[PDB]
Ligand binder design. Structure first.
Ligand SMILES: CC(=O)N[C@H]1[C@H]([C@H](O)[C@H](O)CO)O[C@](C(=O)O)(n2cc(CCC(=O)NCC[C@@H]3O[C@H](CO)[C@H](O)[C@H](O)[C@H]3O)nn2)C[C@@H]1O
Ligand SMILES: CC(=O)N[C@H]1[C@H]([C@H](O)[C@H](O)CO)O[C@](C(=O)O)(n2cc(CCC(=O)NCC[C@@H]3O[C@H](CO)[C@H](O)[C@H](O)[C@H]3O)nn2)C[C@@H]1O
Ligand SMILES: CC(=O)N[C@H]1[C@H]([C@H](O)[C@H](O)CO)O[C@](C(=O)O)(n2cc(CCC(=O)NCC[C@@H]3O[C@H](CO)[C@H](O)[C@H](O)[C@H]3O)nn2)C[C@@H]1O
Ligand SMILES: CC(=O)N[C@H]1[C@H]([C@H](O)[C@H](O)CO)O[C@](C(=O)O)(n2cc(CCC(=O)NCC[C@@H]3O[C@H](CO)[C@H](O)[C@H](O)[C@H]3O)nn2)C[C@@H]1O
Ligand SMILES: CC(=O)N[C@H]1[C@H]([C@H](O)[C@H](O)CO)O[C@](C(=O)O)(n2cc(CCC(=O)NCC[C@@H]3O[C@H](CO)[C@H](O)[C@H](O)[C@H]3O)nn2)C[C@@H]1O
Ligand SMILES: [Ca+2]
Ligand SMILES: [Ca+2]
Ligand SMILES: [Ca+2]
Lengths: 103, 103, 103, 103, 103
């Protein structure tokens, strides 16, 4: 088990770390069918998604996908600094795998 | 997958974008049977619903419909500026498909 | 579909609207068996419940009854003005069907 | 159905009201097996638990037990004044049945 | 039943109490498959995990694992002082069993 997001990120293929050190600029959420997902942006336009649950996900990720969306919404509303995101870069928007926040 | 609420909204029939750039003026919620829903309004009078779950919804939307009502409650209480809504315009009130929030 | 709490409330037998325009004075909730409920009061004396779930309720209302208790707790803690309540008046305390909040 | 926490407390055996009129001093929660529970204390030393769900509880209490842990956490973090607790006094620490909160 | 975290912690094999008396320095959470977890650090460099749900865990712990992650996230965002952690020391990072918070 990893001790930090950078290390956890590197346990997967098709990942990269984005270092933001900034609050979220915009939070978007959708309940439209086949687009049950969230999208966030930062002030420079970099855009990220929490993917729609799909075949690529294993069952244990389902709860976690819901929690991440909970996280992003509260982070946005509290203007919390996001340190890093670990993302899969084989999707557009890059798909969030993990988030770190630090003051 | 879309990168933003406008493009997402364009993936569906019977939808349009409202551009509000304003906080929620009122939040209403009901537990009355066949009316388990939320309704919001803006100061310009525009009124939107989170629809009662119905036969038009697919199963993957049920959790996202609960999430949206969570989101609208917290956005209301935090006076968060709603940027745009993507809504179905074949329902009265217009039915929320997606929301975007930015400063 | 109604557009506001007053019209929604009138879709049911045994309901009325109370107009508070005040924050919640006290919040009470219970885990005791057969009294899994919430009770709120206002400074004017008015007291309301969220009913214990029972067979008077259809299944779709179960989640909304939970949500309503969430809403009342957070509105209490945030000192949010409650505008109106739709209640059933064939219970004592009057049973909450819907709430509206506005500045 | 009762109108207040004292009357509700009186519908059960082995209970009493404690009047705190104070915020919670400490919040403790555990995920260890067989000790899935919450413990709070007040500055006067008084200590209370939300019991581990057990065979004494009826199905309808399960969700209310989770909700009470939620309520205690948020009451702690927001330094909400706890007015009264209804507890069962045949457990040690005394076990929370109900809570009231007021300015 | 125990009345505080130290005594609770002592009812299990392979645990220890860490005393932090400090806010959380960073919160990380992951939805990557097999790494559905949270990791927190403090400014003293100490690092702790909420374990991925696993076969070691009994059924009653699953809800409490989710609750813990909720607790850590909101502790972080409110800059709540963490008093103590009870951890299992047979995992790297040490795995959270229980948390106490006090001003
Ligand atoms: C910590 C750990 O177990 N890491 C392993 C992961 C992991 O088991 C799977 O990602 C969990 O589903 O599986 C890795 C990986 O890099 O993802 N893996 C996966 C596979 C074949 C199946 C596969 O690619 N699953 C990942 C799909 C990806 O799912 C992602 C979401 O979880 C994203 O949607 C991404 O865009 C998609 O490519 N072969 N190796 C190997 C890596 O060592
Ligand atoms: C991104 C994507 O998958 N978009 C597609 C959507 C989508 O698959 C469905 O809406 C998901 O249920 O289905 C589309 C759509 O526009 O909704 N679709 C669906 C259909 C036939 C069935 C249909 O109209 N289902 C949606 C009914 C609408 O449900 C909405 C709620 O989700 C609202 O209640 C709206 O008022 C109602 O008309 N014809 N086209 C085509 C579009 O390309
Ligand atoms: C918008 C809508 O569908 N409104 C209709 C409602 C509604 O279908 C049911 O209340 C939902 O269960 O059912 C109405 C109603 O007024 O409640 N209805 C239902 C009935 C027969 C059964 C009945 O009275 N169910 C409601 C019981 C009430 O449940 C309420 C909780 O939901 C309260 O506990 C109230 O104290 C209790 O009397 N007769 N009229 C007719 C109304 O037009
Ligand atoms: C409003 C209401 O229905 N009140 C009744 C309650 C109630 O039905 C049960 O407590 C719900 O499970 O059941 C009462 C009660 O006082 O608890 N009751 C129940 C019984 C036999 C079974 C019994 O004692 N159940 C309660 C056990 C208590 O559970 C509590 C958790 O809910 C605590 O853990 C407590 O320490 C324990 O003694 N005898 N009286 C009588 C009371 O009038
Ligand atoms: C209050 C109480 O019931 N305490 C008892 C606990 C408890 O029943 C179990 O931990 C609940 O799963 O079980 C104890 C314990 O110390 O864990 N126990 C359990 C066992 C054999 C099975 C066992 O080791 N289960 C715990 C494994 C641990 O699970 C933990 C998560 O819950 C951690 O992942 C930890 O790293 C791992 O070693 N031997 N003693 C004895 C202790 O008296
Ligand atoms: Ca700070
Ligand atoms: Ca204001
Ligand atoms: Ca205000």
């Amino acid at each position: 088990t990893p001790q930090n997001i950078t290390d956890l990120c590197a346990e997967y293929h098709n990942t990269q770390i984005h270092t933001l050190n900034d609050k979220i600029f915009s939070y978007t959420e959708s309940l439209a069918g086949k687009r049950e997902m969230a999208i966030i942006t930062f002030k420079n336009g970099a855009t990220f998604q929490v993917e729609v649950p799909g075949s690529q996900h294993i069952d244990s990720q389902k709860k976690a996908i819901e929690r991440m969306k909970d996280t992003l919404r509260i982070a946005y509303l509290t203007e919390a600094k996001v340190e890093k995101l670990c993302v899969w870069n084989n999707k557009t928007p890059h798909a969030i795998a993990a988030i770190s926040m630090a003051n």
